[PDB]
């Protein structure tokens, strides 16, 4: 029945339903926290990030010891 009508239906109804469901669901606030604004106070706990970039002797924790902080300079700034 109406070959063109059937083809258009099978090709479009899935698309229309997909669009509707995407509008319903993909347009909902996710669980990811919103980006931190500079004006707002820093509420999150301290965040220390490290590269894990170089090789660290052996993976074994023991034997690393604590040679020292061995500071090697400094800097400062105020935005």
């Amino acid at each position: 029945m109406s070959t063109a009508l059937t083809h258009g239906l099978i090709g479009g109804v899935p698309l229309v339903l997909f669009a509707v469901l995407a509008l319903i669901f993909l347009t909902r606030k996710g669980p990811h926290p919103d980006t931190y604004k500079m004006s707002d106070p820093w509420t999150h706990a301290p965040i220390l990030w490290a590269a894990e970039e170089p090789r660290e002797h052996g993976h074994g924790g023991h034997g690393h010891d604590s040679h020292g902080v061995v500071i090697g300079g400094g800097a400062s700034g105020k935005w």
């Binding site: 002797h57 052996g58 993976h59 074994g60 023991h62 034997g63």
Partner: protein
């Protein structure tokens, strides 16, 4: 008195000549004992067998297109017009005792010669046995491979046959005559006129028994002399450096094992000449331009050229009042293949920048880009080789002939890329496996920790162990690492009695203790030599 005779002959040799120093140098020359270094010896031995069988075949073969009715012994071909070449090939097969065996082992030796040349080329390319030194050795080896290919091409074409004559008509005639500026001129000068010219087989006979084999012998002499005096390179190892050769001396061990390997290779070739049928020319009727079969393939070494012919998509150009047939495409493709193969070491050095004198091979995993390129090239070669066989592949494995042709056409640009990517990543992952073994030790059976339910594989470090459990990671040294305690001193001392019955405990203990002492001595000698060299 054999000892007296030997001493007297040695004195006579050293008095007539003075070969003591040179002979001692040859006997003391050290050769690495890696199996992959026997791949060239396979080709050399197959070449020797080829020569020995070819002399026998020449004693009975008559090259000529002079037409003759068979009137021989093979009934299914009697009274049929055939050339003297075909008639005498049939005579070798049937009316000469052992002639069928000799020609079959000759053809099998040719196939093994090509295959072992290909495997040796793979070995050297993947291990980098061509860079800075030995690059000219690689060049002449490439020439040798090309000569071997065309030598086999003329060989299986020598007995004027339906299959081989059809192959000649395709390649030698069509490709030669399609070449634009001088194609017909080369065709007429090779064939002494039109395709069935009465001198083709005599000319190929000369080329195949004297000219090309003479050049192959000269180039093999140059190859072996270069390997001999440019001491064989070796894989990185305990005592192996760029300025030494660790292995076994020529006289006691290397010579005997090389001779034994020659014996075993010729035994394999003879067994296959007996048990497996190669080129049944009696089944393949005499060449006639009007007759043809469906197979129509060349030997596996020319199968890639034939597959290129099949796959290339019928692109022809017609300049002003002229034609440029599709044969020129495949001719230029072969030219490019050979040029790239011959010039790879120089291409590689130009690209990377390494002109350092390299005597230590590099594992194919340690060179991801080159192993990837070699895998890509081998994939393309296999694609072409199976494209040439698409007829029988389609026939037996039920796949439409058009489907096989287009699978080849698409793959020859898709499959090389896939294999390149896969081989590159595979090499890098082999490197990663080596590094993990270096930094964690070999893997073993799992153990459940006492207090808690932790599971730990209970590795075994390959180097000094830190004060705590974890070891000090070692640095990769370009040499294979043992990834199974199987291959280390772990569970390797079965009762040394026999397969059916034991031996006395005293004898078993003596034998095993002596073996362990010998292993300790060998490892200590290697360790001390390594320390002395690097310290």
């Amino acid at each position: 008195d054999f000892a007296k005779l030997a001493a007297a002959q040695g004195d006579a040799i050293d008095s007539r000549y003075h070969p003591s120093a040179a002979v001692r140098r040859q006997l003391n020359k050290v050769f690495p004992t890696h199996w992959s270094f026997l791949l060239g010896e396979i080709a050399l031995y197959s070449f020797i067998i080829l020569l020995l069988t070819g002399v026998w075949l020449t004693l009975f073969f008559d090259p000529s297109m002079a037409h003759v009715t068979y009137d021989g012994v093979y009934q299914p071909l009697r009274g049929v017009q055939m050339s003297r070449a075909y008639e005498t090939a049939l005579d070798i097969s049937f009316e000469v005792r052992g002639g069928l065996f000799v020609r079959q082992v000759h053809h099998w030796a040719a196939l093994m010669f090509a295959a072992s040349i290909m495997v040796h080329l793979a070995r050297i390319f993947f291990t980098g046995a061509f860079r800075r030194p030995r690059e000219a050795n690689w060049v002449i080896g490439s020439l040798l491979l090309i000569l071997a290919m065309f030598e086999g091409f003329f060989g299986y074409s020598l007995p004027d046959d339906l299959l081989s004559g059809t192959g000649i008509r395709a390649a030698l005639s069509g490709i030669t005559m399609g070449i634009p500026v001088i194609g017909t001129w080369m065709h007429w000068a090779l064939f002494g006129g039109d395709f069935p010219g009465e001198i083709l087989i005599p000319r190929l006979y000369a080329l195949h028994i004297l000219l090309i084999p003479g050049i192959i012998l000269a180039l093999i002499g140059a190859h072996l002399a270069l390997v001999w005096f440019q001491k064989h390179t070796q894989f990185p190892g305990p005592g192996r450096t760029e300025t030494n050769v660790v292995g076994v001396r020529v006289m006691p061990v290397f010579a005997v094992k090389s001779g034994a390997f020659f014996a075993m290779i010729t035994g394999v070739l003879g067994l296959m000449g007996g048990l497996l049928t190669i080129n049944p020319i009696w089944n393949l009727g005499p060449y006639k331009p009007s007759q043809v079969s469906a197979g129509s393939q060349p030997d596996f070494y020319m199968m890639w050229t034939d597959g290129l012919i099949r796959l290339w998509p019928a692109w022809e150009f017609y300049p002003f009042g002229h034609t440029i047939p599709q044969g020129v495409w495949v001719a230029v493709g072969m030219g490019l293949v050979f040029a790239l193969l011959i010039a790879y070491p120089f291409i590689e050095k130009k690209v990377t920048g390494d002109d350092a004198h390299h005597n230590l091979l590099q594992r194919p995993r340690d060179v991801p880009v080159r192993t990837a390129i070699g895998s890509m090239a081998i994939a393309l070669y296999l694609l072409l080789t199976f494209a040439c066989m698409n007829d029988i592949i389609a026939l037996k494995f039920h796949i439409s002939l058009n489907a096989t042709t287009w699978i080849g056409r698409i793959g020859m640009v898709v499959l090389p890329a896939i294999v390149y990517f896969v081989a590159y990543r595979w090499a890098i992952s082999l490197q990663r496996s080596d590094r993990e073994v270096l930094e964690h030790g070999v893997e073993t059976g799992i153990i459940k920790r006492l207090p808690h339910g932790a599971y730990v594989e209970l590795h075994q470090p390959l180097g000094p162990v830190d004060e705590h459990g974890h070891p000090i990671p070692l640095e990769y040294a370009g040499a294979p690492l043992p990834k199974r305690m199987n291959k280390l001193g772990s569970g390797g001392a079965p009762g040394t009695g026999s397969f059916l019955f034991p031996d006395p405990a005293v004898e078993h203990e003596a034998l095993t203790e002596a073996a362990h002492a010998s292993e300790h001595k060998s490892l200590t000698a290697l360790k001390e030599h390594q320390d002395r060299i690097h310290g």
